[model samples]
Target: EIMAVDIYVNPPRVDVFHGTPPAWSSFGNKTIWGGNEWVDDSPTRSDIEKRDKEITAYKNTLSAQQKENENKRTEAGKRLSAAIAAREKDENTLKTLRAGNADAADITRQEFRLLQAELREYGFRTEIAGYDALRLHTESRMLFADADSLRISPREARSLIEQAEKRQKDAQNADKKAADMLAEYERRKGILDTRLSELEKNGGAALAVLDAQQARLLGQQTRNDRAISEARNKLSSVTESLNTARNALTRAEQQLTQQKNTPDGKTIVSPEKFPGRSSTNDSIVVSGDPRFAGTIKITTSAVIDNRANLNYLLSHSGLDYKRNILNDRNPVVTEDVEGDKKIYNAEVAEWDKLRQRLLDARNKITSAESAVNSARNNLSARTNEQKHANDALNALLKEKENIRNQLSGINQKIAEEKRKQDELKATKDAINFTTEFLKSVSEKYGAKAEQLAREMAGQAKGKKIRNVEEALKTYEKYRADINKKINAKDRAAIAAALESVKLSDISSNLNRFSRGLGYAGKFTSLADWITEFGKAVRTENWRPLFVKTETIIAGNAATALVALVFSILTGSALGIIGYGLLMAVTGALIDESLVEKANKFW
Candidate 1:
């Protein structure tokens, strides 16, 4: 069964807007209404219509006032669609002039991240530990700022997103300024381009005008040719060295081949040899007596100390071992080296040295050729544009030199103007994109986030200009100090939620103490919130507490009402004071009515 009931809270009382219920999830996933937690339950809406969307221009209208009004209506309609759609992403074709702002927010985030890296730089090795939340506030201009004593429960991401576009009027104002700026820049550059094009084509009126510009360009072309040629000439010296080095390596290779192929496998036999000494049977003869018995000593024709190893000589000579070339002093050989190893090893050393030289010269070729092409590329890039100077002349040749000088200045000026326009357009693009992106952020983050964005979005540290480091340090800091008072066990849960808010959103910031006061009923208890808030005011001290809710509203319902209607859209101090004042009066009226009604009943 389903039933619906009115919702209200007391003690800094809140009554649900349009008598709407606080969402199921923020109240720990149960219906809560009235002052007591789980105050009441009712028929939830059977149907769903929900919320959020981006950047585009408004449709043009026939009449100026009507056009403007309709433009407002058209955007308002899309914004309405965003707020009303079931999901923020469900926004279809949501358009505003703020398309550029998306890029702005993107770069801003990158720059902010980089700054965190630097602060991380200052203290990675040994900084305070336990728990620290890096935070940035638009007003603080301070890093490592003091944490708030009592951190009110942060609003749910979904609600803040709803709260993000809560005020469509601000969107109109923000986008109008952004849209018109881009509009102006676009028109200015269009004028510059058309003027340049006319001058470009105007050489048609006369020939003298063409001749002066032609001669000037001809001179410029001549200089470029000389420079390109000079680069090639420089390349020539290295090219020759490379070729010579290659030849040197080739010549070494030839020497290696010559040494390897020439073979020597000759040795002299003693008996038949010329030169050395002869071996004979009577070379030595002796008789000796010893204890065992004397034996006659006889000498045979044999050479001492064989000059060649048999195996080596055979391998060297390509000889078959079965074939005998023996006795006859065995060709004076037993052990000797084959010439191949000696020659191959000797040749390889010198050969490698030459190849190394070649390798170095080969790299020089790569370097020299690139230099030549580098010069030519430079010449090519400018050639077409410079060549146009020749087409820019005609009968204006009589005043040719003077007119030529003037055209040269125009050429430079036109290029310079193009540079200016490009830079400006880049800036326009980024700022516009960021403006749109910021609209999606909830009021708590949006309050200061939007201010910082407008201050610095398009200047571009990542784009083209602006200081990234300075921007990062200046962005915003979130210091979630987990003081001793908050139980360590509770600290973990509280820290997780706070960090979730960060990851979900927190680039912009302001003090929405009211949001916390409202959540007091959910995270702790309504009475607890009432007591704590009073204590803080009296003691001028505040401390952290932890709790949860099934769902949320940006501010207390009644406070939300006053701010919403009065059009005071911000989580700023002005918002805070206004909410406080409203509470003061509302409470007074409430007590007065309660007593008067009681007396009437009596």
Candidate 2:
């Protein structure tokens, strides 16, 4: 019962003679129970031995699998390194092709012919479509030379014609306006002179008083005219300021639009996309520039490293991995991936949209302010003109009042004397009217002529030359086409490279076991280490014996061949053979041992 309890408690029945051969067999008379399960050892002991062997077999299997995994890991790593090197080289080739530095002189006739044929398929024609077609065929540098060169095109001749016609109409309108103003001024001067003549004929005691009041009114009108001129000048200056402000607002709006349209604005990167929002937000919110399009997000260092490698591999394989691979691997798919909806994308979208809206509002505000400013300038200019008119009317009214006062003071006593004076005054007033009319006509005509000339020279004139907007558009189109071609070729090159060589797939299939084994250098053989060490030594001038032996053989081969040839040509049958043997040995001996010794010591 005690033995039974011991057997049950310790299940694996191990013994001192359990694994030895002595327990299975006997030796003649002095017998030993060599470990034979059926004959010597107990059943429990045999079972324990069997279990131990099974465990060892399983361990051996595991070890073999581990080694195989390690080998695969090493191979994958090598392929990855090789692929990276190839991609780097091919990328530079693509860059060179895109730069237009590829030699035009070296372009073969066949290639050029093919290019032309392709261009023709795209509707390029020689001299058939004028400047547009010519520009398409021309290089960008030549087409975009001068700014003015692009402003006009022969195809848009109607525009130039319309501009010329518009200018002609404007010139005629300006001339008519000047003539009208001159006629109005002439009528006003005639009315004034006619009124003064009636006053002179009816002159009583008020004539002298009326003359004095009229002179004072003239002084006030002169001062008011100067004030109106100054105010008009100020209004013109304010108009310039308003235009500048309006232009500034326009530029700001345009800048905002451009920013929104840029590639950076279309991308999404935000702290919310990553885990641990608080920490990431803190790190990036303060680290990044506010004007930058996308939010600066956070990612683990390991993820960043893995993502960089993945991005490189995928891009070189002609896969357009547009989004950050780190975020993509563990994507925050808040919305449908197929519908262009994404959580981070929405964040950035709202950001850009908000910015654009704010900028637009600012522009509108600026425009409103500018409009108000322009109205102020208009009101100021008109007010100055009205003030001049009011001063003239008041001066006339004051002169009339003085004349009435003087007339009340006058009497019959003064009538005869005044009549004699009035007869003399009538002669002088008629002469004055003739001189003033001539002078006013000359001045009005001269002023109108000068104004008409200014109008013709300023905004009313026709084009002295041609418009170059077409040339600018044409050049820009050419550049766009070139850029498109470059982009297409770049895409094709990457695709071709990807399709042509699919860097060993088995090499990329790595997991934890394989990666860890690779990192641990488990698969590197002793021979490889030795070879690497030899290489390092070779760089320091203590090269391998095998390399020295190769050099010796190559260095001696020519001399030995020459000696053999000389012996064959110059010696008798046996002599030839003897000399050949002798010279060959001598040359080889000198080149191998002697040359090696000479290199080291001589």
Candidate 3:
């Protein structure tokens, strides 16, 4: 839909690449496309508005989703570990408690006691035996006279011993695992250190390569910039020469205009046919040229007097030309006019000057052709220098590539060494872990053996544990001598009351922890905290929230303030340069008489 007539040169010479007139020679003023039908609007206006609205919507939605996900994920992840640990502990404890015989039972109990003692250092509890016993006791019933049979007791005892054995095995494995992990960490740490050292030795070569690459890129960019600058500078020089020649031509044209319009000179025929011997429509209607300070046409019904406004406006006419408009804007309007012979003769002399200037311009154009060729040669020489610099950079790049290629073999050797080291570490750790596990098992078994020995000693000294078989034998021999005892309902109720009292004590301790530590209560920790706090020690939960808000605001404000200060300070430099332009423009406004003063100050 759009059309343009572009003027370009074939084999582009200086005169052809740029237009003849200085005003048309600017490269940036090249003809543009794509504006045929008068839409009178920019396409970017709607697109910009649409993009802004979409971007705002997208940003707000993203922020909302991020906030929701953070809140959910944080709460879930924090609780997941502790909840899973509780479940796993329940399963493990139940399995261990149901293990076999006096030795296994004693050993399991000792292990539990030892583990609990270790945990006590960090204020963590490991024992859950009371709960385990309660759960097992629930299996008893009235239909069975003795719910805990000898077989069940022995089975539970064996299960407990198995659990102990399993624990020893697990501990042995864990010690092995810990050692293996330590060894692996050490091996990797050594490899990373060695590799880092190797990199240090070769880092200078890489730096040299990087420096050479940077220099090459810089040289290319400089060449391109210089090419543009050289073209621009040559164009500017041509423009300056043209402007000087045009000024001289303008003066010569003014002289010719003056000679032709003078009253004393012989009159030439007008270009257009008119009843009055006038050259233009203005003179044909007005009878004389208004530009020569003569009587102008009056379009009125009757004779009229000229007012103060007209006389004042006329007197100030020369002032407008000399002081108001610059010569560049309202230059001497070259045209045919008549009246003052002396002024006309002066213009004729000026015309001769205009003729001489045109001849000079033609001569200068020939000289500029040679200068442009010289500039082209200089540009070619600079380009050659830049190409040599690039070639050196290329050689350095090739060397860098070769060094990088060589690094592959070294890397493979390092990887093989690391794999061997990892296997060796794993074996060492496994041996260490198994040995520790065996030691723990031996210690547990030794303790149980010692306890059994003590039991045997006690039995030899006259104390005995009567099993079901022994009890049955005693019952057969002394059935008549043994007194039978019965449990009364009052005794059962008293036992219930005692259990209630224990539960109440536990509940009271839990409740004390649940409340704020305002006064001392059953819980030992809460009691200690409350007692230390004299009456008025208050704490607000929102203290942390306020602190976080202040921290965010302080950080944001500091960043914003720094950016704002830098922008204003840096922009002030450009602002000062603009002030200099304004001063130049102001000086240009002075009249011709004040030109000397303006130049002096400038």
Candidate 4:
């Protein structure tokens, strides 16, 4: 049903593998498959319409039977517990009577035996009430057995249905995947084909592109490495300057302190060769001539030590004095010091200069440190970018191989896949046959249940029933009539499943015990709520709706909103009403089912 073709690499490139063009390289524009067009096959349109159309009804009927069975099973559990408790209480009372009195004992014994007789007397009631359902086999036989069989009949059929559904799903996906996968493969192969075609045809354009990007990445990498190195060296140089500047600043600070602490008087003024000081007592000549040994004078500046000079005094006598004064030291033994008032301004200027230098050093180190981290982060990115590009190149080589293989082998794959799809049609056919037919069968019985319940209620009205007991007898009589209806040749299973919901129970449950209050005498607002509600349920004796299963209201074309406010009337939408303000599963103003099933379907 499908056609496939392969276009070889126009001029061959290899000895081992058939090389194909990568798809991105759009050298020539045409597709490999023949359908830019579509069509449908014959004979199966009826089958699809038949099954899909009835699927909802079939699902609903199956669901209803299961739900009804569960409801009966729950009711049975409660009654079964009641049966157990009743027997236990009777046994305990019998024991007490044995100790106390024979009369009570005998009476309890009679009652206990009567209980079993009563259960068997109401054999249908036991089935309805689940009296024998306490034991596993008995409950399995009576309670769940028929619903279970209904479930089992479809077991293998539904599996085939599921398998057929999956096959259809996979079949559709396969068609899509072929288009998608081949498109991808074609694009990839075109890219490879163009590359090979270019090397053989366009003077190594692919290789040229690869080298261009590769060198650019390498250039960026080298620049980043060099930049980090320069940053490191700059940081080393900057920090070295900062450390020395700090040392210089410390030295200046100490010197400033020393200047401030230079005690009492140790300020230097000037160097002098002559001392000029004379005491009046020392001016008296103690020896003659040679102008006596020179009188010492002080370097007094308006009155100071050793710096400002006074005129020289006559030398005092001894030759020893001349020898001492002019010794090889050629100097004064203790030079008189000048104590000038020292201003510490110069040292402060020095400390401040070095402090500024230290600050400059700190800022430069931070700048250099930032540059190194910037370069390193950039280098890391470059390395990653390089790796990504290299990976992309490696993937190209891999993809190049993949596309060539796909182009070479795709013809056979399509043929094999076509056969697989063709074989699955019969499975799909049976699924519809099983589903539509079984659904048609179960739905008839569900409709029968609906019919039976309604028939019983109709006759109860005809018989003019008043109390619940009469109502129940109405159903009992109807059920016997119908038991004959299902008691036929091969309808055993339907009879068993019908016990799941006793139509007797259904009938008595629909008739109410009390009367509905009238429009004049009844406090109900009679405003027609056709605008407000749109579901059909029967409504009658709408007041005092339930008394332990006695509240079965008339169920037909208006909801039991009449019980609370009044009856909600509608000619035909479907649902039920239970307690106050109640509308059940099907109760809705607007309901939509699958669109194609459309309105007699809606």
Give the candidate number with the greatest TM-score: 3
lDDT of candidate 4 over 1-602, digit per residue (tens): 11000111011111111112222111122111212336432214444343333443444444454465556455435544554564566556666667676864244334444343233222223333221122222222222212211122245444544554455444444445444443444454455435433333332333344445555555655565555565555555555555555555555555444433332112111114222122211121122334433343323111113332111101221122223432312222333211110111222232234333333433444454455555555555555555555455555555446544543454444444345344323323322332342234236434432232222221222121134443333333333332333234323322222223333343221222112111111222222222122111122122222211222233321123222211221111122111111221111110111011111110
Question: Which residue ranges in model 1 land beyond 4 Å of their true spot?
Answer: 1-411, 442-602
TM-score ranking, high to low? 3, 4, 2, 1
lDDT of 2 by residue, 479-512 (tens): 3332333343343333233233222331222111
Q: What's the lDDT for all of these models?
A: 0.29, 0.33, 0.31, 0.31
Cα lDDT, model 4, residue 124? 21
436-472, model 3: which lDDT tens digit per residue?
4324423643433222212222111111122334323
**Which candidate leads in lDDT?**
2
TM-score of each: 0.16, 0.16, 0.19, 0.18
Over 107-193, each residue of candidate 1 has an lDDT whose tens digit, in order, gives 332333233232222221111110011111111111001111011122332333334343333444444443444344445445434
lDDT for residue 304 in candidate 2, whole number 0-100: 14
Candidate 2 — which residues are off by over 4 angstroms? 1-204, 264-421, 424-602
Q: What's model 3's overall lDDT?
A: 0.31
Error of 3 at 269 (Å): 4.6
Candidate 4's displacement at residue 348, Å, is: 99
